[PDB]
Symmetry: D5
Subunit: 175 residues, 10 copies
């Protein structure tokens, strides 16, 4: 089980948004004011679509506004990460995205979150981690439809509302 | 992990939408045409909003249309699942619901799906199972904010929309 | 074996008589002056009869008068406990009983007293626990006839008599 | 636990009510028509009142009427069970009794029923066994106050009364 | 092996000669000036003969005169021991004997001396224990003929002679 | 324990009464008609009196009459058992004896009967074996005072006397 | 050790020289006529000179002439092997290469050949496998200085030169 | 794995170049300024050719000039080593070579470097060990063609070059 | 122990007296008519006197006459055994010898006979094996002083002399 | 293996030369100035010949002259040892020999030297033990021909010579 427990930390090398590589990127030292969204994806230079990487790069700003950071990780090295970032989008590239990409080269991180599939690559999953390094929400999927990048943003709202004016519902539930 | 693997099959007392009580409800049977949406909730007679149950009761029909059954499960007993349905919603009751409610009295199911929290109650989580008892998608959180019924539906659509029309990403 | 040994303690949430919930109800901190009667029962919102719960609620006062408290427990949560107490007796409810109802949600207590049946629910059993947390008498049954709620009261008498004018019997036993 | 499970079957020396001495008394045989009432007591020649034995001797007939045999057991040997029956009750004797007395010399029976106290003597406890060697009810305490014979009877009645006429609780 | 080794001690309840019961009778604290004869026997209220108990009771005095005490033990409780002592000899009783009778209720003593037969009763055996708690001689038998009660007495003599004027024999053994 | 159990059977070099040397003397063979009297002694060429051997040599005939063979055993080798018989009794010799002397060179026999003391020599002990290789009586001590031959005989008698005429104890 | 033993056979995705993507490339199949030269390199898209890849691409033909296939392997995925070939060499690309590139995504191959460094990437090492899946020669270092392609060739020659003409050492 | 790790040390007897035997020759105390080349070979007084020993003896000076020492080892005793050195080259001898020959009589060293073949003799392997006792390069072979003696010398150059003016290559690799 | 037990059979390279090199020399084969004399020595090319080898070379014929083959063994390889024979005895060589020299390269033989000292070399020891692969005599020391060849012969004689004419000790 | 290792010590009862028995004879405290010859033999009062005991008794003096003591041991008790010494030689006896005879009654010594045959008796073996309790030479045999008593004496010479003027041999071995 992952949800409710401490989000497993990691110190791996990651390619920042500005493309300069951080050798010892640490999950916990890179949280938003309200936490972060850690997400995985099978592999770089995929043949299908970066559905995941795409959706998320498009919300990075919406998330910042909500106090959350976006951190994506893949079992690919940081070199190949960088490469994908610099490969022209039409040429299959990913384009210079705005979030850190972590290199889980030894597949340890994926294992820790239990998304490591058949000892090779990470599933398409995302985790809502709060300011206390606790995983509150988690959605993992095994299909191309990278909906969770969006969905997560929707949960981040539901969470900040509920966190505020608490939870309300069917006016006739208790009277 | 749960996803990408065969959905752990179970067999337990359940309180069908029509308050009939099945004693040996097997997941591996009551599937939809394309699979099912198995979902959990902490406990019946909660003082917090049933959110999970509500959101799922509404969308039961759609999930159904698109060939997906909806099975709810809790660590509570059918006797109470039952009693919860037959209760004035202002009295905190749940009210007659469409989907079957499975009684995971031995908490074995919550464990197989790994949602058992502190050997006591299950986490608010939902699972998408295809026509081959394959867990293809799982969402799980620990707060009332019911959105599992929602997202699972959207996921059911998205999935199927893709079944045919691909998705030349933007 | 349970009888003769220390009554295993527990700290679980229980719905009091006045219906307000005690989060950390402790068996040992809730004893009568002469001890207590701890009793179990399969499940709430039963379809049959609360024979158990009934019989016992009707003696709660008789027991108080004897210096014993009544404490019933079930593998059901405290919410459902509360529910049953507030469900109209004719509607199947239990009515606002006068004794604490403990929620052995994790089935640990039932296990401790060895009444936990097939890893799911508690048998219909009752335990006479003295002022020293020792279980002196125990009667467990697996039928609807909740006779032991009564029976226990009878033992509590036999005990207080025996405890007083000691044990007497057939005038011609020793001469 | 003992209840809800098959009553551990045994086979040992016993001193039948008619002072005849059976060498291989098997519980699984000497049942009643509806089952039996197996009961233990600390030790023969006790200086405390035999209470258990007394109360059970009286009710032997009724338990019998209602189809229930009554088998007593102690960790003492048949030689002493015997000698205890043939003793002036003012001399602390027990007196010719109706039910058979089993000699649990190896304390194995007391163990199977889990009444062996300190690897020495058995606790004052009684067990209700139905026609299927099923322990359905058990009462066990640690004080002379004999009420096991009593309650077991009342239980035998109650049980049977219900066998037919239910019990629309009050 | 028992002989040559320390006689295993025990603290059990025993019915004395005068019939008052000693709760914590201790083998070592009850030795003669020259040691003691510890003997066992199957069970009380036997149907056959107390051959054992008889023979021994008749020598208790001869043994005392030799500086040895007689202590008999059986897997029967002290109640039944007492009983047998008070049951009229013709009625099968044992009669008010002159030696302590120990109650090896838990069969531990019999086990210690390795005379415990088939986890139930003690064999008919006797041990010559000296002033240093060492078993010098042991005779165990499995038949009704309680000859060892006698025999032991004969050994106690041979021992006190040999202990004195040492061992002598066939005048032509060494010259 | 040894008594009440099958006498551990052995097979080893033995020096028969007639100084003939059997190489594979099996206990289970050389029994008497009613059984045997197996007995041990510390060591040959002892400076202490052979007591055990003496007392047993005398009674060999009677033990024999009553259907009981007499087999002696020591941890010493047949070569020495032999040499001990052929020695001037004033020279500490034992002298031609009637019973066979078994050589328990590997001390395995002394162990099976549990008389091996300090992994070295055997204790002065004797065993009564009935026609069924059953140890029915055992006497064992640790001092010269030979009385085993004696008592075993008296025991052989007593036993047999009872075989017929009971013994209405006094 | 690896040498003198059967070359661990594998089966994984590979990007053939003609950018075709084989899913089940088995070493035990794609051998040469005399064997093969299996070789590893740390990682694709390296910022250090691909040395290994370069030197091997050149000599692919000769190794081929002499009956030796050339299979390269990395812990990277075919998707990236592919993408690495289709990249401007000034952009750090590798450029269309002649030999197949195997994707050791589970690092299992690097392990079997024992070149897996820190459970992460493979060491710059090459292996000579004869027509019998026998590792006959292995060179392995940990620095860019590509000379494996070189020496392996010279070794392929030398070896074969000897196949016939011996070598009366100087 | 051997490369990248610390070169296992050893203290065995070795026949020096000047033929006097060093009883406790220690790998680490016998390194060149830049390291050393440790090489093995099946056995002395071979029937085939000393290809290995030959090639290597011919570069000993070249390696010295590069700051490396040559140290060869074989599972043969140092007596036989000495013998071979003094056996006339045409008589099958090896001739008075200029490098230390180590006697791995117990086959431990060979085992350590994992060149020990079928519990009997060492494979034909060579190891490039740096000034920090780390094995940088390793080439092991199972054929007569002792090419690695040469090859190693070539690597030692590549290394000192690379170590200096670093690594260069295809002018159009990055621009 | 080695003696009184079957001589551990081996099979290894050996350099027969006639410098022919057998690859699979099995002890269990090359026996004499009455058995063999297997013997070890520390190491070839020793700077200490070969004593063992010398003394055994001389007596090879006699040992032979009396039906005893003579097999020498060392932890050195046949290549060196060979080279040692073909060496000027002033050059420390051994010189063409009559008996076969076994190469115990894996030290397994020295171990089976338990003469392996410090997992390195064998102790100067000799073993007498009869026509049934039975070790009947063993001499083993740790100093040059060659006398094994000697004593083994004398033992071979003595033994045989006794084969017939006994030996009424003095 | 025994040779080269420390000679296992022992403290057992031994019948001296003068026939008085030493209760705690200790191998190490009974060495000659140059060591000792420890020898075994199957059993006393043998039916065949004391070949062993004979040969050795005849050299006891020669050995003393060489600085070595002779100590023979047998799995027989010291009583029987004594007996054999006092039984007239023609009567099969051994005669009053001049060396200590040890009683390995528990077969431990035989075991320690690994001459204990089939858990019963000792093989005919002899060990040359030096002044440092190290077994330098060992000859064990399983036949009647007690040649080693002699042989040992021959080795003791070879040893004392070698120990002195060292080892010499074939004048043309090294030149």
């Amino acid at each position: 089980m992952v949800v409710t427990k401490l989000a497993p930390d990691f110190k791996a090398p990651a390619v920042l948004g500005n493309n300069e590589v951080d050798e010892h990127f640490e999950l916990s030292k890179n949280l938003g004011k309200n936490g972060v969204i850690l997400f995985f994806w099978p592999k770089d230079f995929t043949f299908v679509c970066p559905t995941e990487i795409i959706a998320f790069d498009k919300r990075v700003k919406d998330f910042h506004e909500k106090g959350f950071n976006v951190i994506g990780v893949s079992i690919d090295s940081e070199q190949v990460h960088f490469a994908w970032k610099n490969t022209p989008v039409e040429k299959g590239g990913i384009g210079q995205v705005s979030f850190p990409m972590v290199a889980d080269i030894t597949k340890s991180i994926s294992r820790d979150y239990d998304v490591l599939f058949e000892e090779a690559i990470a599933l398409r999953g995302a985790f809502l981690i709060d300011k206390n390094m606790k995983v509150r929400h988690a959605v993992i999927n095994d299909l191309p439809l990278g909906r969770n990048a969006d969905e997560m943003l929707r949960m981040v709202d539901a969470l900040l509302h509920f966190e505020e004016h608490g939870e309300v519902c069917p006016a006739g539930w208790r009277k």
